[model samples]
Target: STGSATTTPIDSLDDAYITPVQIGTPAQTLNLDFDTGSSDLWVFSSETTASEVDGQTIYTPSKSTTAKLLSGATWSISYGDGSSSSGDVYTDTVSVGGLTVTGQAVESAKKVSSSFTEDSTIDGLLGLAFSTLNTVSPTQQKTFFDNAKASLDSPVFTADLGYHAPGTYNFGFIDTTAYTGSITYTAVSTKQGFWEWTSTGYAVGSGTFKSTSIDGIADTGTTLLYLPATVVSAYWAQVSGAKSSSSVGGYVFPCSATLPSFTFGVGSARIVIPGDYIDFGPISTGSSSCFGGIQSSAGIGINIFGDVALKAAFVVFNGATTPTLGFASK
Candidate 1:
């Protein structure tokens, strides 16, 4: 059997997508950001201070008959973008699409950073990464996907992310109709708790493919594609007026400047990102300066194939004995 749900973009292509998920007995539905970069299902809850709460919906565990507090249990998490949250733990029923898992570890947030509080539309996060990354203290927690894997017809999930459009996340099955051409599979190293892989090389526009290999992570929660500083410079060199901006952060180019296509190698297969997609929205509203989607990942050490890059392809996260990632044109 297969289960699937639509993920709608929250704010154009700048912010991440949001999907509805049900938690607890009566099924308190929440709009969650299904993030593949981190593992921990956390929600704003009754425990949150009234002053800290905004327009975001809160999950009241007391209202659910099946909710059980795990005494002494707690969770804390910080994101690369500096967003963070911490909370108490509870065991409850969690459902995504048609798939449901009982006794799922649900982290109910008591404190959220300003970034989360400002984003009133998103109630919480549903982590899809390896469960080892869970932040619950004393005992680690299993994500909804991990708990539902055994019961799934197939232990695989596919992400079809789109730009300013509707996408679908498929569980327990693969839908060939969602992509074009043949799927290319690559080995993934979960050592860092991410969908980490090495790309053979990359090319700018119709330029020659570089033989230099780069290590990167596929993160759906991220908004921009980050690469080495040298690479980012090379890509923008062709665009006049494109330069590094200390004020704006990263590289910014004239809004009218044309961009070249960027391509990354997954084994022998090539995932190409269109030129227009490389020019992220303007640096600021009503500003003629635009930010380049491909920026420097120098300090981070690892490159990030964020939504800007992932939306250019169809991705499959296979959870077999030796987990692998499959990519195809969408």
Candidate 2:
């Protein structure tokens, strides 16, 4: 029966925090950045010297009467942003939404830099994205979803970016009432994290593909859309008067005419990125040029279809039951 709803915050961009379902005794609570780029859950602690963890929040174990450090183990992590952290492993009850997950693996880093630090809220991050790159593993490592899946009622997790509301990132079960219809499920390949997709081809105006093939991953963690240098060059070639210029960042083009709509495919799914997404976030280079979010990378195996593109659709990560993704109308 759909009755009164509990309006809790869904991951906010600035002051985002999550209440893990299980936290031993004192009921440990942690502030987290709901990142989908990597699959690791870590935090900073008082043991980390102030100088080492420049600008990151350090959790005070003493504040949580039940917090216990895992003995004989040390942990560290590196982000693509050139920032890293190191600390000891610990165990405690972690809470997110209405669930409590106990004996959770957490890294208490001593050194954290500004790339991840200096945020208004959140003490650490909960990497919910499905990827093999993580701290929790049994030789393969254990992810929070790997553990919480057995306990979740739906065995599915959905990410709803409250663009208008700007709320906290929802975890555990997904409330379907918030959406319009049934979620469309997509079969996942038995591979590591970082969603690798096959692009069928491009659609000029509406989402009508002409048939082609490209391999890339859809990532919510990265802010910019990175394409292979070849793809960037080829894409820009389509725009009239679009020429490569070095001074205006990796790739820059004239913004006089409306850019053509492009389509990126995944299996049978064809996603359309409005020309505006490539135009709005342009930054000036010299006096009369600017660059959009697209950047050129030399032979990087992983081509990330960043958050800008993802925001156009409703996404669900059903890692609890089976590692699957569900898409719906925004």
Candidate 3:
């Protein structure tokens, strides 16, 4: 079986992407962030505190006959900012992009950080990472992808992230027309429950490729590309007056500065990120200073290849017997 969905950019800067999803017997629609960085299908629902709930849509389990409470299932997830969301778990009929998963675990949030309440664009999060990352207690549950894998024609999915536009999420099969050039393949380590892989090398602008290998995760949930400080320095060094500032967070520079394209290797294949994409956006609306889409991951411990980099290429997550990642130009 095959399933496909459209991912629309939520903010002008492409902070996050959201897709409409259906849950419960009557199928309540909710726009959710399909996050590949975490594993937990959590949502803002009837249980969420009235004060915590913004204008975002919420799922009401009471309205669905298919909704069944788990005896003692509970879940919680934290973010990079120290904020978190957690609540009770229930099983209900869930569908995404026309693909259905019977009895999928749907976590109803009773507690969410203030940040979530302030941003009403997303109603919830639908995890696409490995099942091992699931946070449900008592008995860990499988992700929607893991539960639907058995029914898919292939144990795989693909991400076609866009720059200032809408993208797509495809399951069961690859979309031949979505990418240009042949996809280069690499092995993924499921050990950390992310789409982790080793990148062969990288280069700044027209610079030659450096033969240093870097290990990192492909996180759709993240908005920026984070690499080792060395590579980050090399990339930023080309842009004059770019400096790291603690106040603004990370690197910031004059918006008028010229930016060079970034290129990274996938084995022998070289995927290039356009110069304009690296500019990110202005730090503040109508401000002359801009933030970089590429930044240093020195203290992050793990390198992250987020939307800024992923948007330049088509990525595939093959969750077969041996998981792998495929990259191609769009």
Candidate 3 per-residue lDDT over residues 209-279, each given as its tens digit: 89889999999988899999989988988988898889998988789998999998898998899988888
In candidate 1, what are the lDDT values of residues 1-330, reduced to their tens digit? 567888888886457888888889798999999998999999989998777789988899999999999989999999998889998999999888888888999999999999999888899999998998999999998988888889889999999987778789999998989999999999999999998998888999999999788889889888889999988999999899999998888999999988999999999999999998787778789999988899999887789999888989999999887889999997
Residues 192-282, model 2: lDDT tens digits: 5655555555555553456666556656656556776766666677667666666644666665657665556545665566666565323
Model 2 lDDT on a 0 to 1 scale: 0.58
Q: Which residue pairs show backbone clashes in model 3?
A: none
Clashing pairs for model 1 are none
From the highest TM-score down, the ranking of the candidates is 3, 1, 2
Stretches of candidate 2 off by over 4 Å are: 1-30, 52-56, 118-122, 130-132, 136-141, 162-168, 172-174, 178-182, 204-208, 234-249, 253-262, 279-290, 320-322
TM-score of each: 0.97, 0.76, 0.98
After superposing candidate 1 on the true structure, give the runs of residues whose Cα lies further than 4 Å from its correct spot.
none
Go through the candidates in order and give the clash count of each: 0, 30, 0
lDDT of residue 19 for candidate 1 = 87
Can you tell me which runs of candidate 3 are displaced by over 4 Å?
none
